[PDB]
Design an enzyme around this catalytic site. Sequence first.
Site, PDB file in Angstrom:
ATOM      1  N   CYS A 146       1.448  -1.072   9.298  1.00  0.00           N
ATOM      2  CA  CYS A 146       0.968  -1.024  10.674  1.00  0.00           C
ATOM      3  C   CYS A 146       0.588   0.404  11.017  1.00  0.00           C
ATOM      4  CB  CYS A 146       2.016  -1.552  11.660  1.00  0.00           C
ATOM      5  SG  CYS A 146       1.463  -1.414  13.387  1.00  0.00           S
ATOM      6  N   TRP A 151      -2.530  -4.262  20.959  1.00  0.00           N
ATOM      7  CA  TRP A 151      -3.939  -4.210  21.314  1.00  0.00           C
ATOM      8  C   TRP A 151      -4.732  -3.862  20.053  1.00  0.00           C
ATOM      9  CZ3 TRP A 151      -0.468  -0.859  23.760  1.00  0.00           C
ATOM     10  CH2 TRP A 151      -0.398   0.425  23.200  1.00  0.00           C
ATOM     11  N   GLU A 191     -10.756  -4.070  13.481  1.00  0.00           N
ATOM     12  CA  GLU A 191     -10.191  -5.390  13.215  1.00  0.00           C
ATOM     13  C   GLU A 191     -11.117  -6.503  13.678  1.00  0.00           C
ATOM     14  OE1 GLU A 191      -5.661  -5.602  13.767  1.00  0.00           O
ATOM     15  OE2 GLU A 191      -6.237  -4.117  15.276  1.00  0.00           O
ATOM     16  N   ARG A 247       2.101   2.249  14.786  1.00  0.00           N
ATOM     17  CA  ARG A 247       3.523   2.336  15.074  1.00  0.00           C
ATOM     18  C   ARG A 247       3.914   3.528  15.926  1.00  0.00           C
ATOM     19  NH1 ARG A 247       6.046   2.318   9.392  1.00  0.00           N
ATOM     20  NH2 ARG A 247       3.846   2.659   8.741  1.00  0.00           N
TER      21      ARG A 247
HETATM   22  C1  HEM Z   1      -0.157  -1.595  19.769  1.00  0.00           C
HETATM   23  C2  HEM Z   1      -1.229  -1.476  18.981  1.00  0.00           C
HETATM   24  C3  HEM Z   1      -1.226  -1.937  17.509  1.00  0.00           C
HETATM   25  C4  HEM Z   1      -2.215  -1.660  16.658  1.00  0.00           C
HETATM   26  C5  HEM Z   1      -3.498  -0.859  16.981  1.00  0.00           C
HETATM   27  C6  HEM Z   1      -1.877  -2.244  15.392  1.00  0.00           C
HETATM   28  C7  HEM Z   1      -2.637  -2.174  14.250  1.00  0.00           C
HETATM   29  C8  HEM Z   1      -2.369  -2.813  13.066  1.00  0.00           C
HETATM   30  C9  HEM Z   1      -3.314  -2.947  11.968  1.00  0.00           C
HETATM   31  C10 HEM Z   1      -4.761  -2.431  12.024  1.00  0.00           C
HETATM   32  C11 HEM Z   1      -2.700  -3.607  10.980  1.00  0.00           C
HETATM   33  C12 HEM Z   1      -3.327  -4.002   9.628  1.00  0.00           C
HETATM   34  C13 HEM Z   1      -3.476  -5.522   9.591  1.00  0.00           C
HETATM   35  C14 HEM Z   1      -4.934  -5.876   9.409  1.00  0.00           C
HETATM   36  O1  HEM Z   1      -5.750  -4.947   9.184  1.00  0.00           O
HETATM   37  O2  HEM Z   1      -5.281  -7.085   9.488  1.00  0.00           O
HETATM   38  C15 HEM Z   1      -1.344  -3.917  11.417  1.00  0.00           C
HETATM   39  C16 HEM Z   1      -0.356  -4.550  10.708  1.00  0.00           C
HETATM   40  C17 HEM Z   1       0.880  -4.914  11.230  1.00  0.00           C
HETATM   41  N1  HEM Z   1       1.312  -4.754  12.527  1.00  0.00           N
HETATM   42 FE1  HEM Z   1       0.484  -3.487  13.920  1.00  0.00          FE
HETATM   43  N2  HEM Z   1      -0.648  -2.870  15.495  1.00  0.00           N
HETATM   44  C18 HEM Z   1      -0.214  -2.714  16.802  1.00  0.00           C
HETATM   45  C19 HEM Z   1       0.973  -3.210  17.320  1.00  0.00           C
HETATM   46  C20 HEM Z   1       1.941  -3.887  16.644  1.00  0.00           C
HETATM   47  C21 HEM Z   1       3.145  -4.454  17.241  1.00  0.00           C
HETATM   48  C22 HEM Z   1       3.476  -4.365  18.772  1.00  0.00           C
HETATM   49  C23 HEM Z   1       3.811  -5.069  16.242  1.00  0.00           C
HETATM   50  C24 HEM Z   1       5.165  -5.798  16.256  1.00  0.00           C
HETATM   51  C25 HEM Z   1       6.028  -5.668  17.271  1.00  0.00           C
HETATM   52  C26 HEM Z   1       3.068  -4.869  15.000  1.00  0.00           C
HETATM   53  C27 HEM Z   1       3.402  -5.326  13.751  1.00  0.00           C
HETATM   54  C28 HEM Z   1       2.599  -5.263  12.618  1.00  0.00           C
HETATM   55  C29 HEM Z   1       2.974  -5.755  11.315  1.00  0.00           C
HETATM   56  C30 HEM Z   1       4.359  -6.376  11.003  1.00  0.00           C
HETATM   57  C31 HEM Z   1       1.939  -5.529  10.472  1.00  0.00           C
HETATM   58  C32 HEM Z   1       1.761  -5.805   8.954  1.00  0.00           C
HETATM   59  C33 HEM Z   1       2.579  -6.919   8.313  1.00  0.00           C
HETATM   60  C34 HEM Z   1       3.136  -6.407   7.003  1.00  0.00           C
HETATM   61  O3  HEM Z   1       3.691  -5.278   6.955  1.00  0.00           O
HETATM   62  O4  HEM Z   1       3.032  -7.133   5.990  1.00  0.00           O
HETATM   63  N3  HEM Z   1       1.934  -4.168  15.298  1.00  0.00           N
HETATM   64  N4  HEM Z   1      -1.183  -3.399  12.686  1.00  0.00           N
HETATM   65  C1  LIG Z   2       0.441  -6.666  16.966  1.00  0.00           C
HETATM   66  C2  LIG Z   2      -0.823  -6.358  16.188  1.00  0.00           C
HETATM   67  C3  LIG Z   2      -1.864  -5.656  16.774  1.00  0.00           C
HETATM   68  C4  LIG Z   2      -3.023  -5.411  16.014  1.00  0.00           C
HETATM   69  N1  LIG Z   2      -4.046  -4.722  16.581  1.00  0.00           N
HETATM   70  N2  LIG Z   2      -3.134  -5.872  14.733  1.00  0.00           N
HETATM   71  C5  LIG Z   2      -2.122  -6.571  14.162  1.00  0.00           C
HETATM   72  C6  LIG Z   2      -2.234  -7.046  12.856  1.00  0.00           C
HETATM   73  C7  LIG Z   2      -1.173  -7.740  12.277  1.00  0.00           C
HETATM   74  C8  LIG Z   2      -1.313  -8.303  10.909  1.00  0.00           C
HETATM   75  C9  LIG Z   2      -0.364  -8.260   9.896  1.00  0.00           C
HETATM   76  C10 LIG Z   2      -0.641  -8.880   8.676  1.00  0.00           C
HETATM   77  C11 LIG Z   2      -1.839  -9.570   8.496  1.00  0.00           C
HETATM   78  O1  LIG Z   2      -2.151 -10.196   7.320  1.00  0.00           O
HETATM   79  C12 LIG Z   2      -1.242 -10.193   6.232  1.00  0.00           C
HETATM   80  C13 LIG Z   2      -1.075 -11.619   5.732  1.00  0.00           C
HETATM   81  C14 LIG Z   2      -0.310 -11.579   4.417  1.00  0.00           C
HETATM   82  C15 LIG Z   2      -1.821 -11.763   4.417  1.00  0.00           C
HETATM   83  C16 LIG Z   2      -2.754  -9.645   9.520  1.00  0.00           C
HETATM   84  C17 LIG Z   2      -4.053 -10.395   9.313  1.00  0.00           C
HETATM   85  N3  LIG Z   2      -3.877 -11.809   9.695  1.00  0.00           N
HETATM   86  C18 LIG Z   2      -2.485  -9.018  10.722  1.00  0.00           C
HETATM   87  C19 LIG Z   2      -0.014  -7.988  13.000  1.00  0.00           C
HETATM   88  C20 LIG Z   2       0.102  -7.507  14.299  1.00  0.00           C
HETATM   89  C21 LIG Z   2      -0.952  -6.816  14.884  1.00  0.00           C
END
Ligand code: HEM
Ligand SMILES: Cc1cc(N)nc2cc(-c3ccc(OCC4CC4)c(CN)c3)ccc12
Lengths: 411, 411
Positions: free
Chosen positions: A110, A282, A287, A113
Amino acid sequence: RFLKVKNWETDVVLTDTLHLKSTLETGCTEHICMGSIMLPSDVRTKDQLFPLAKEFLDQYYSSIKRFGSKAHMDRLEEVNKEIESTSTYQLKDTELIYGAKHAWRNASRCVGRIQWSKLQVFDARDCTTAHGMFNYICNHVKYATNKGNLRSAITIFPQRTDGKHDFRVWNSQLIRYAGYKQPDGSTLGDPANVQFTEICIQQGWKAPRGRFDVLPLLLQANGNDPELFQIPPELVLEVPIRHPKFDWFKDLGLKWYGLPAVSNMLLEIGGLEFSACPFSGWYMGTEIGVRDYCDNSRYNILEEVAKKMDLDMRKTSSLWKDQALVEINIAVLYSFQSDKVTIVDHHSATESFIKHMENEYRCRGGCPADWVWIVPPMSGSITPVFHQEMLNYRLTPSFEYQPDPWNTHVW
Amino acid sequence: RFLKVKNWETDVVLTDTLHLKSTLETGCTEHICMGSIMLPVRTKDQLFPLAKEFLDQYYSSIKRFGSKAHMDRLEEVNKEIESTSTYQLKDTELIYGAKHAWRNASRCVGRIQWSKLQVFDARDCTTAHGMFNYICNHVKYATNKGNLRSAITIFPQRTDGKHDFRVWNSQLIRYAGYKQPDGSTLGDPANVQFTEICIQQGWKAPRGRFDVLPLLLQANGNDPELFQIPPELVLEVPIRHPKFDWFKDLGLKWYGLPAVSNMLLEIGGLEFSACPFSGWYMGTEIGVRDYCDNSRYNILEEVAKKMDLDMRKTSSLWKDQALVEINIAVLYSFQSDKVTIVDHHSATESFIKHMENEYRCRGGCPADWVWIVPPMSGSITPVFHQEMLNYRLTPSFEYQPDPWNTHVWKG
Ligand code: HEM
Ligand SMILES: Cc1cc(N)nc2cc(-c3ccc(OCC4CC4)c(CN)c3)ccc12
Ligand code: HEM
Ligand SMILES: Cc1cc(N)nc2cc(-c3ccc(OCC4CC4)c(CN)c3)ccc12
Ligand SMILES: C[C@H](O)[C@H](O)[C@H]1CNc2nc(N)[nH]c(=O)c2N1
Ligand SMILES: C[C@H](O)[C@H](O)[C@H]1CNc2nc(N)[nH]c(=O)c2N1
Ligand SMILES: [Zn+2]
């Protein structure tokens, strides 16, 4: 053993000691690195559950400067008793909030964070039905959307007991657009959701069969058959996508929702498993515009945008895909910003994340980070994370992947 | 034991058995992934098992495993190591070794070409002048008037580590960099340290923005010596843009031939510390990294200014916009001068084809996702969605420390 990471743009070198607290396993060995595999990886016996709680309670009471204190030992023994008797235990609200904030803090993939400690935690552990789930999820959406001034939130439904009474949100995100396969060939709407859009109709959903139809919620409480609910449209904030330079852009008829809300992950705290925990924040612009619109297996509107730009689409070396990709992402950020809907560009978010790494190495001894996922899907090397060495490891509490429930649900 | 990788865009799944033949270590463990770490005098005791493994490989590839030729060769090397503590490769072994080092280079996206490598045996070389001659002929042959050809020139292997052949240049052709008293840099900031060494060694620096550096060549562990590549051998391409007529006025040019000369070639436990190899450029190596990296020529600003972009807020994506224009110009300029170059879309597509072929006919293709994915427009290239396994196979190209840090100066 006290590993160092270097930023090759700045020569800044951080020392990582946090990885030595790492519990789970990465998927790699000394002979093979699996750091580009998407997924490495049905109840807990009383014996495995006890040390998981102790480790969690140790770090919780350390975080509030009460390691080895009255309350610590008492809570340790009180949980110990409850596990011996009930075979599980219940988190105090303070532990629940700490646990969820730190699951986000520990999410190595993420980039957002830096905001980890500002999470709004909604305790839904008293929920008993899918209608009740629907109520909690509607209130989550309303609070998180906040008329476009988005706020991070998680809603935590009852923890797993014996794997037969699982709460699950069947959607991958609370808000997603339907995808229907056409009788002739191509796909209408979002191809990533074709199977789910099918399981909805195949469960009773009346599909408007449009391009941007918000999918119904498919909510499962206490292990029963999941139920359909339509999110009130006034609760789903959408953004029409226009370009600040090209008037024809608006005519493409594109829009996206403002609230990214992931709902299919499992939240693990102190050994307890929360199979239903939709969380939301957000978007980062890429994305929507890089992945949702331009992936070949998604909306794939690249070819269309380039034809409207009158670009030479005859050879790849004109970089017409690249040029159109940038324009699309300019539009997404322009649209959200014009409608005062929170969004962050990939330069800003990656810069924020470098500062966050700085903070975590200073006040915590490191920050687990997955370079393959942190680097944005465009313009990778002009963002500061590209030149940042990162160490990836698994800390608990954590968000974990879980099988899609329809592959598992004794229907 | 079998291992599987999946392409999430095509759902193609491949099976990797080749990682079982893996010798060395990755840097990763079960509890930490070092996949984004930039960087993660040999005795008879450990040499003969490395020779034997190499010769077993070599004789398998020619369908002569267990043959009398094979067994005699093993005995011969065996006796040569016992008696001399090292051994010499036959010409056929050297050529096989060098091709397979490239074939095994997990960070190399251009490996589809690996079997078409021109190997120049320079193991009879004895002095730096002789190195200058071999390297000149390499540059002439590889350049081929713009119709570039892959080549490698192999100088004598290490003996006691006190008589190493080294090319002190990181690449055969590179531009000088000069730190000014005001802190600014003239030329290529990546080469300031090596430029200073050259100047100290007696190079008369013209102090321009695009000065081709002299060769600094070390034979048999002696002090290095300076040579000037004949300028008629150094093919260069003025950078212009097909739409923007002001682009030529930025005064940019680049050289046609990427020839990496600071790596170590390992074949059957022998170490070739001087082994310059060359191919042709992927556009992004120049137009993304060489020009737009903040720690390089960093021309993003002036290109953005002359495009009259909104440079106030990064969310305008002016950086992404100028990066694409620069990369269009690099490709246009090379193609207009008929100098071999490959854009990142074509190069990544070929690598996927290569990689599938390698799984089918070899059981695997070790590959470093972090390096294979281009530094711009990542997810719109097919390698982005391709799972990959990274592991070390020999023959191999290894990194080695810069020689000025280890050299014992004769004076
Ligand atoms: C607040 C603005 C946030 C932004 C801009 C953001 C951005 C991202 C991005 C760009 C990814 C990569 C996933 C992808 O590209 O499809 C990601 C993964 C992830 N986000 Fe964040 N996120 C935010 C908030 C949060 C919050 C609030 C949570 C949980 C409370 C969270 C939990 C996660 C998790 C668990 C993953 C990846 C799952 C893994 O590690 O396998 N995110 N996030
Ligand atoms: C709160 C939040 C905000 C954001 N702005 N982005 C976020 C993207 C993910 C996230 C994590 C894993 C993931 O994919 C992994 C799956 C094992 C293949 C995807 C795509 N569905 C999104 C999770 C949370 C997000
Ligand atoms: C012919 C066209 C070739 C192209 C287009 C190409 C492209 C690339 C690129 C883009 C990289 C990543 C390095 C960076 O981004 O700076 C790379 C790495 C590398 N390439 Fe190639 N290359 C080619 C030929 C060769 C040849 C002929 C050799 C050796 C005989 C070679 C050996 C390597 C090695 C050793 C690495 C580093 C790999 C590692 O550390 O695992 N390449 N290449
Ligand atoms: C023959 C060839 C052609 C090309 N078109 N490109 C090439 C890029 C590299 C290469 C390898 C490693 C490396 O950097 C490694 C870092 C020290 C660990 C760099 C960066 N100059 C380039 C090597 C050979 C290349
Ligand atoms: C920190 C990171 O590992 C480092 O910047 C790497 C990332 N991937 C790369 N990939 C390529 N092709 N070239 C590079 O120089 C790098 N640099
Ligand atoms: C194969 C590859 O690991 C896979 O496509 C990953 C790569 N990196 C990613 N990075 C982000 N941020 N999001 C993704 O979906 C992916 N997909
Ligand atoms: Zn790894």
